[PDB]
Amino acid sequence: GGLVGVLALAASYLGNLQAGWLQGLMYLGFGVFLLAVLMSRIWLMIPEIFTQAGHILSHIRIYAVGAAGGILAGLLTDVGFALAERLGLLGVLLGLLVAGVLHLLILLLTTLGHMLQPIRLLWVEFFTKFGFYEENGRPYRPFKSVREA
Amino acid sequence: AASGGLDRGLIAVGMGLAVGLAALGTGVAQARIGAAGVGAIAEDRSNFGTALIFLLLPETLVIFGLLIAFILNGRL
Amino acid sequence: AASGGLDRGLIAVGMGLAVGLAALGTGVAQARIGAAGVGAIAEDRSNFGTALIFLLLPETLVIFGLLIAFILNGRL
Amino acid sequence: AASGGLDRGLIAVGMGLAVGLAALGTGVAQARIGAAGVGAIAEDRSNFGTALIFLLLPETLVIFGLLIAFILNGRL
Amino acid sequence: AASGGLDRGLIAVGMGLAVGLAALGTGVAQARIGAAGVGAIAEDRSNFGTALIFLLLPETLVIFGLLIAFILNGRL
Amino acid sequence: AASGGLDRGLIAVGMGLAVGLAALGTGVAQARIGAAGVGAIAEDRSNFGTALIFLLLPETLVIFGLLIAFILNGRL
Amino acid sequence: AASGGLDRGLIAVGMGLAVGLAALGTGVAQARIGAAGVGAIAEDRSNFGTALIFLLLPETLVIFGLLIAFILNGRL
Amino acid sequence: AASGGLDRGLIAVGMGLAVGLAALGTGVAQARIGAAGVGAIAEDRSNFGTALIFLLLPETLVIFGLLIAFILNGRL
Amino acid sequence: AASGGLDRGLIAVGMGLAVGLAALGTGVAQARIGAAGVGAIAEDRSNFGTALIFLLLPETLVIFGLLIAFILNGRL
Amino acid sequence: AASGGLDRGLIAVGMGLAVGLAALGTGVAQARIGAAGVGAIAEDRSNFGTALIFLLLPETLVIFGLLIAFILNGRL
Amino acid sequence: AASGGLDRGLIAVGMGLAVGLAALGTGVAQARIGAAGVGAIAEDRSNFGTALIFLLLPETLVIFGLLIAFILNGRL
Amino acid sequence: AASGGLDRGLIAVGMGLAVGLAALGTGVAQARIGAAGVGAIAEDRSNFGTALIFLLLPETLVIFGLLIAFILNGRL
Amino acid sequence: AASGGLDRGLIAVGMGLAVGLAALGTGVAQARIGAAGVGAIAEDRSNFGTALIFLLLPETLVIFGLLIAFILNGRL
Amino acid sequence: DDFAYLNARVRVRRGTLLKESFFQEALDLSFADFLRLLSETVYGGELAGQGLPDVDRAVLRTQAKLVGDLPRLVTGEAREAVRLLLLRNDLHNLQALLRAKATGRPFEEVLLLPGTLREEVWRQAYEAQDPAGMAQVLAVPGHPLARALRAVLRETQDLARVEALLAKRFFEDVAKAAKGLDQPALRDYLALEVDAENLRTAFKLQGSGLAPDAFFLKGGRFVDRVRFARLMEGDYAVLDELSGTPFSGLSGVRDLKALERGLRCVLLKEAKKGVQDPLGVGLVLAYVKEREWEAVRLRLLARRAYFGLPRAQVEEEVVC
């Protein structure tokens, strides 16, 4: 129920100039739509929806990092074989080759770290009761065991 | 774009602090709760969802900081 | 940045800083209670809710910085 | 983005820091005690009313500040 | 107030900090003693006057600012 | 309030920091003795006048900030 | 190189705070959690993943710095 | 009141630091020892005089600062 | 060498900041883990290859410094 | 005297730092020894004397700025 | 190389900073890691070649300083 | 005397820093060893000729500082 | 008094800092290890041979510097 | 703080041993000679004349003066931890008081080991008639065992059952309490004790094989209710399945006496880990254990010597 208003606010920064005004103080009625049935069950612990919102920012962050750390990886071949030193010069190609053989193996080791992030993202989703039996235990084997091969 | 100045600078300045304050808080926070899990797992392998649950969580603070840091760009 | 105004700029820097310092407070806060949290499965399932509820409170720290951000600018 | 007068950038300064520093201190303070509390509930169901009296104290520090901060600030 | 040059603004800055810096200190102070406190009631009902009293003592630091500040209040 | 030089600005400001730095130090100081402190009352209810006399000593640090404040102002 | 633009300087400063703070934070976060582990390595070559798994979550922070640095680039 | 000038500010600042730096050190010194102190009194009412006599020593530090602080400003 | 404009001047500093700072981070990270590490060797020479590998990840900070120190000089 | 040049104040500055930083060191050095020291009396009245004697050493650190200062002065 | 223009003063300061900051970090690293080891050694004489290798790792930080300083000065 | 050269002001700060900081390092060395010590006095009455013999070698160092500080001046 | 113009003073600086910052690292290293180290002899007489090999490493930092201090002098 | 002092105090304390060779002689020492050997050693400082009750008494006092002093110091995290150890044996003593209290057996003949609570607490407790009142007394200074005793007492006032269910419940309290530190070594040794207690209890109860959990104390880490159960069913194969578990000298053992020996060795091997453990509780802990282990052999060998009993009679049991 909340979401339409989210899109409303988002646009003025999301295109900056491309959008922001296909919606507005749309939020004021959209926020009401959100909470209606949380309140119908009563729920003596309603504020707790805050944490459901936290996951969204996290999902973004994991992809972002998976990308950025990703990008960084390509750029080490660039400051490891290509251009960097001084303002960026030609002979850096083979000055860096002193380093060049070295950067390759280091790079290899670390990118393995990046792929655990796909799974970190996934782990956000897996125990968040979106068609799942685990919920910090609960009869059924962890998901941990399920995906590996 | 265009020559800097102290006002532009004031907004330019704050961008690192926003990410940094939030980032620092997530790491220290993660270090004690995060620390708690290896023994729990060891003792009770079944208990892992908790260990696993501790680490994700402080990290929301850093995400907020970065957002403030970003927003200043495109207003700087 | 902004309209300009070094004074306005001065009020602007700190509105964010208010948000950042609190974020730092919120994480550390989550960490000590989180440590209690490994304890929680053990102590009482009934109290588990309490432990969980205990976590809810620190984000308020943050709220003060943002109130200062809404109220301050636009106004300036 | 607008403007005010010369005063506001200067007057603003202690107002943010006041909310942020107290807030940071409050988060740590409340958290350790919040953690501490949990042994008492299991042990004594009775202490839950006590727990209700106990926890409150560091958070007050900010409230006085909002009152003064408004008389000073938002004074434009 | 919300009028005046930059210099007057400096006298304003530190008033919050007196209160704020002390506030940060009070929270940490409250956390160790407070932690000590929960057990004292919990085991010992008799200890309630002491425990209730105990948490208070660091808190004085902040308070000094409020009396002078209040007599000042809005003079500037 | 009042307007004048750069000199006036340093002294007016400083009244809080002097108090604040010491305050932060005192709070932690009182806290270690205090946490320990809760136990003596528990042990000897009888001792309570002694215990009451005992706690006091670290608290002096703040008072110096106030002493320097009496001297400094008058250029405020 | 040479005499940097007034603009380039504002962003260039803040460029450092992001890389240094996150990098430092990750190493320390890894170190405490890292410290707890060692008997397990000996015990179980297979179980090894848990201490290791612990380290991965903090790893996000540094990478965040690179993203904000990325948007700035060509203005710096 | 007072008036500015580049020379004066350096002396105006430092008088407090001499006292302040010592104050922080003294408090921490007392805190650790003070905590240790509390049992000795309780059993041995006799040990109370000793507990006090032991406790006293770090406070001298501040006084050194005061002599030096006095020496700085007089020029001002 | 000789005179430098604002970019060069800013970088000249940071070449040093970089070398000192990384070393500091590396040391702290190393202190907690390093303290933990040793008993295992005594027990197991066999695991020693694993140990030799074990210490390594925070240490990365120093190497980044040499490449950047190299890069800075030449915009210097 | 009066507002002299920048130098008298600047030269004045560094004298304090030596004394102050060292002062902080004395208190802490004394703190570890004293706290342990309270335990020493308890454990051994005969070992109480070493602790008592031990506590004395750190205070020299403050003095170190002053001996070089006495000889120097005739240039303030 | 001796007196010169605007760039040089900046490298000369920071050349020192490179050395100072790394030295503090190495020392801290040795203190915790170093402290655990000797009992292990007491048992394991066996480790002694290993002991020459084990201590060795934080110490690299110092070496890093000599190249950056030498190349900077003692080479410019 | 009084105000003088630009060289003196720049030079003056760090002379003090050299004398005070070395003092802090020597003091910390005493504090931890002292802490270990009362059980040690009991244990190792035996080391005293030796203990006495090591102790001698560093005290010469203190004199080197006073000298170096004395000799350097001629730029102050 | 002394010579004027900023540049020599600017070059002058790092020699004192070299003594202070490195000294904090040596002290922190010396204190924790030294307490175990003198002690190693006390329990374990065999460890005196070990102690002779083990303790030794921090001592290099000051002596190269005096040689370098000499090298530094000639820049100024 | 104060484990700077504690490990160090311990470092000196660890010296007053009566070496392995003491015990080896003792095999070959008559009672008089055994006594002579003892009088020249630290137990000798509590030995006046010659005679076994005196040896044993000397042991109590010897352990007392070097360790028993320590519970009054309670202030460090560690001191509290140490308090837990002592509390457990003492918990036995408390049981001895409770049981004494119930059968018209007087208060006066129940020796206590160095107590966190003084003589008068015990006296009051004894003197505080109702089972609630006795328990309430122990709580006056504070005693997690008081409250536990009460917790068990809340349902009925049946002394023996209260003691039994309490022992399980207390070791359950302990499980949390030991967890409430960290200073692992005590925790570890204790964990091995849980396993060990389970093995012996199952052993004591074997062939009963009822509802095992009433006798299975929880906190098994290589043992579980079923393994316990199986042994209690009489299935000895459990020890043969509890192999490659941390308890290897129990393998194939079919007697409790040898069982206790193996267990002592395993746990001892764990206790021995502490020798230069910092805040990590090992150096003091191990030291307490040394005094313990020494005491065991001395008393055993004292009798051996006294009655002239074989070398072979002590041979399994004065080594681990």
GROMACS .gro file of N, CA and C in nm, chain L residues 35-36 39-40 43, chain N residues 4-5 8-9 12:
model
   30
  944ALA      N    1   5.212  -0.363   3.719
  944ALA     CA    2   5.089  -0.437   3.734
  944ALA      C    3   5.112  -0.585   3.750
  945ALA      N    4   5.206  -0.642   3.673
  945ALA     CA    5   5.245  -0.780   3.678
  945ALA      C    6   5.304  -0.810   3.813
  948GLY      N    7   5.293  -1.010   4.265
  948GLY     CA    8   5.310  -1.153   4.265
  948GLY      C    9   5.450  -1.189   4.229
  949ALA      N   10   5.507  -1.110   4.135
  949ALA     CA   11   5.643  -1.116   4.090
  949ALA      C   12   5.740  -1.085   4.199
  952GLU      N   13   5.760  -1.380   4.389
  952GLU     CA   14   5.815  -1.483   4.306
  952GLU      C   15   5.961  -1.467   4.284
 1065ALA      N   16   4.653  -0.953   3.637
 1065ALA     CA   17   4.793  -0.921   3.628
 1065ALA      C   18   4.860  -0.979   3.748
 1066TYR      N   19   4.797  -0.939   3.861
 1066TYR     CA   20   4.822  -0.986   3.992
 1066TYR      C   21   4.785  -1.129   4.000
 1069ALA      N   22   5.015  -1.381   3.814
 1069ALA     CA   23   5.141  -1.363   3.882
 1069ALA      C   24   5.150  -1.421   4.021
 1070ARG      N   25   5.043  -1.408   4.101
 1070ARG     CA   26   5.024  -1.457   4.236
 1070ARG      C   27   5.024  -1.605   4.224
 1073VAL      N   28   5.393  -1.754   4.127
 1073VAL     CA   29   5.461  -1.788   4.247
 1073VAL      C   30   5.401  -1.908   4.317
   0.00000   0.00000   0.00000
